[PDB]
Design a protein around this nucleic acid. Sequence first.
RNA 1: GUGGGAGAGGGUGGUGGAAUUCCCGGAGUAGCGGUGAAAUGCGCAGAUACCGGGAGGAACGCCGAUGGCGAAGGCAGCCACCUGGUCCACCCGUGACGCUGAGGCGCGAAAGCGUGGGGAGCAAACCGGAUUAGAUACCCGGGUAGUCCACGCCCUAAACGAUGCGCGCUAGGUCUCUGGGUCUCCUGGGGGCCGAAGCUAACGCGUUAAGCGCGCCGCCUGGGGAGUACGGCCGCAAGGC
Lengths: 88, 117, 71, 101
Amino acid sequence: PITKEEKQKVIQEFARFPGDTGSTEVQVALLTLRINRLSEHLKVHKKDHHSHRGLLMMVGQRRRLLRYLQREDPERYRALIEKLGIRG
Amino acid sequence: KRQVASGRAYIHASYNNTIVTITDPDGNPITWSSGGVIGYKGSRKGTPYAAQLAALDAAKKAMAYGMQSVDVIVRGTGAGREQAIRALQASGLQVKSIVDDTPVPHNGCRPKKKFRK
Amino acid sequence: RKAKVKATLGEFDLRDYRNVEVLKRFLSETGKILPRRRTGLSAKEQRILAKTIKRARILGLLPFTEKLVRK
Amino acid sequence: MRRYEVNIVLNPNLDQSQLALEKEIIQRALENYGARVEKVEELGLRRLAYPIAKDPQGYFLWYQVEMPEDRVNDLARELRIRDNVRRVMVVKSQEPFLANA
RNA sequence: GUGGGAGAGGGUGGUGGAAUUCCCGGAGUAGCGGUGAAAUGCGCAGAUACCGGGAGGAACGCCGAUGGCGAAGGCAGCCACCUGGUCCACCCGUGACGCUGAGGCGCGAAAGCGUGGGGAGCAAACCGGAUUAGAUACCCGGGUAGUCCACGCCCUAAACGAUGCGCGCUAGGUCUCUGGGUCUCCUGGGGGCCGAAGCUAACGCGUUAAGCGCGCCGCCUGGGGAGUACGGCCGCAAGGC
Ligand SMILES: [Mg+2]
Ligand SMILES: [Mg+2]
Ligand SMILES: [Mg+2]
Ligand SMILES: [Mg+2]
Ligand SMILES: [Mg+2]
Ligand SMILES: [Mg+2]
Ligand SMILES: [Mg+2]
Ligand SMILES: [Mg+2]
Ligand SMILES: [Mg+2]
Ligand SMILES: [Mg+2]
Ligand SMILES: [Mg+2]
Ligand SMILES: [Mg+2]
Ligand SMILES: [Mg+2]
Ligand SMILES: [Mg+2]
Ligand SMILES: [Mg+2]
Ligand SMILES: [Mg+2]
Ligand SMILES: [Mg+2]
Ligand SMILES: [Mg+2]
Ligand SMILES: [Mg+2]
Ligand SMILES: [Mg+2]
Ligand SMILES: [Mg+2]
Ligand SMILES: [Mg+2]
Ligand SMILES: [Mg+2]
Ligand SMILES: [Mg+2]
Ligand SMILES: [Mg+2]
Ligand SMILES: [Mg+2]
Ligand SMILES: [Mg+2]
Ligand SMILES: [Mg+2]
Ligand SMILES: [Mg+2]
Ligand SMILES: [Mg+2]
Ligand SMILES: [Mg+2]
Ligand SMILES: [Mg+2]
Ligand SMILES: [Mg+2]
Ligand SMILES: [Mg+2]
Ligand SMILES: [Mg+2]
Ligand SMILES: [Mg+2]
Ligand SMILES: [Mg+2]
Ligand SMILES: [Mg+2]
Ligand SMILES: [Mg+2]
Ligand SMILES: [Mg+2]
Ligand SMILES: [Mg+2]
Ligand SMILES: [Mg+2]
Ligand SMILES: [Mg+2]
Ligand SMILES: [Mg+2]
Ligand SMILES: [Mg+2]
Ligand SMILES: [Mg+2]
Ligand SMILES: [Mg+2]
Ligand SMILES: [Mg+2]
Ligand SMILES: [Mg+2]
Ligand SMILES: [Mg+2]
Ligand SMILES: [Mg+2]
Ligand SMILES: [Mg+2]
Ligand SMILES: [Mg+2]
Ligand SMILES: [Mg+2]
Ligand SMILES: [Mg+2]
Ligand SMILES: [Mg+2]
Ligand SMILES: [Mg+2]
Ligand SMILES: [Mg+2]
Ligand SMILES: [Mg+2]
């Protein structure tokens, strides 16, 4: 699974400031963590479909958030993307 | 001619026939009987009366082998299993205990169409 | 009206599959696991007790089946 | 690392030398699979509900351990290779859930 | 975000006992089986019943519910691992990032198809025994595909709550699962029954709406002809849209 350790690490990483937990950046980070994870899982276990749905959903949430960021502040969006390496 | 004198009595009782096997304490048969072993042929093999008669045949045939006390074990639910037990009850054989062993699965095998639903 | 298995006990770990003389209290004349009617357990309770019993059986501590005496 | 309980049920006919040897192998395996032993309860022989391996009874070992998860199955695998090992049950440790306390 | 929770949600590997069947052995002997009654069938090459040993496959009794989980299909022995969803408390973080969703893409019971395994029990087709006025069927004895597994197709259904999704609003009572609480009880989230107002052709629905509203999607337009014909798309085919 994903330990509190690793998670806290990715928050501390992407946080806009100290204490920042639920900002778009962070959310996208966490989401991408879970997605790479779940995706690695599905690379094996080609048959676990129910989990795959979860994948789809996580992907969607992430895209919506990215979409928002891009509309709002293209700067921080480009930063976020290049930082996570997502589609670019 | 073992002259056994104490043993087990298995009543296998089905909607169809009743059949009784007397055995030594290690479970090896000595004598046996059934609705068919006596006069009965068709469905008559299953009535409780046939059961009584059969248990009694097994009994007598066993006492000839010199047997005195026996432990009853009852497999299957069928007309007159209770009758066969009752027949041993006083067969002259002392019945030491009765026990119900009826096999039931934890659901292994698909039943015949007759037995499902 | 007989009595319920829970009332007849003090504190006991429902998760302890090693402990027998408590567990066997929850099996019938046969080795069947007793209904809530008889166990007096709650939903969650009963449900935990099941797995407990089962583990116990696999460990060879409690039976899957028993013969029925008299009859 | 996570925290489990390894139950071992082995041959009750075992003499002292052989029993020492099996406990030896068990310890060694536990080590090579990366587990640390927090505590052990050796109950020894006890009367089984149903016969296992033609035997009316069995010798009981219980270990509480902390070990790496991705290992655990192999551990059990290895533990069962022994001809003399009748049952092995590894279980994730849980807290007590009680009633009437 | 933090801290908890319940769960047959999913995938992988392992493992347990009951039973069936078959094989080996012991003991035993005249029948067993089966039906309304029977017969075919099986049995002196020793069956049935009983005891011990073995192989193998498939499904998991009690728990078990009126229960739970899942978007649906669906999911049930136990163990570990991998993994999805979801509920509660705190009210800490972002600051409208929302809803719906043509097409697309994915999932999709059973049966069916392809290749390769597997095959205990069951069992379309089939071979028999009976019943009947005949019996192509209902009952009985056999039995192949199939049922099981891997991978790839198929895309249907009384795929049913015959009730699209989301949010707000409108009496209560009672039982229940699962949280948190100052724990007769209050407060969340599910599952049920009865019922206010209201709705309804009626039957019924009624905070789990079939009420009162707004948003968006799908769909209907008399019964046949017909889910047929033609065309197109998909499919190895059966056939599907
Ligand atoms: Mg008969
Ligand atoms: Mg072994
Ligand atoms: Mg949260
Ligand atoms: Mg959490
Ligand atoms: Mg599950
Ligand atoms: Mg599973
Ligand atoms: Mg498995
Ligand atoms: Mg068996
Ligand atoms: Mg033989
Ligand atoms: Mg008739
Ligand atoms: Mg013959
Ligand atoms: Mg003949
Ligand atoms: Mg001869
Ligand atoms: Mg046997
Ligand atoms: Mg075979
Ligand atoms: Mg076996
Ligand atoms: Mg039930
Ligand atoms: Mg649901
Ligand atoms: Mg294991
Ligand atoms: Mg989880
Ligand atoms: Mg705030
Ligand atoms: Mg602010
Ligand atoms: Mg949607
Ligand atoms: Mg399908
Ligand atoms: Mg299928
Ligand atoms: Mg064909
Ligand atoms: Mg096939
Ligand atoms: Mg073959
Ligand atoms: Mg058959
Ligand atoms: Mg016929
Ligand atoms: Mg006909
Ligand atoms: Mg016919
Ligand atoms: Mg008929
Ligand atoms: Mg047939
Ligand atoms: Mg074929
Ligand atoms: Mg409809
Ligand atoms: Mg819709
Ligand atoms: Mg939504
Ligand atoms: Mg509470
Ligand atoms: Mg409610
Ligand atoms: Mg409630
Ligand atoms: Mg209610
Ligand atoms: Mg009214
Ligand atoms: Mg009215
Ligand atoms: Mg109502
Ligand atoms: Mg309300
Ligand atoms: Mg209406
Ligand atoms: Mg309507
Ligand atoms: Mg409306
Ligand atoms: Mg019109
Ligand atoms: Mg018309
Ligand atoms: Mg059609
Ligand atoms: Mg045309
Ligand atoms: Mg056409
Ligand atoms: Mg295609
Ligand atoms: Mg073509
Ligand atoms: Mg068709
Ligand atoms: Mg369609
Ligand atoms: Mg359609």
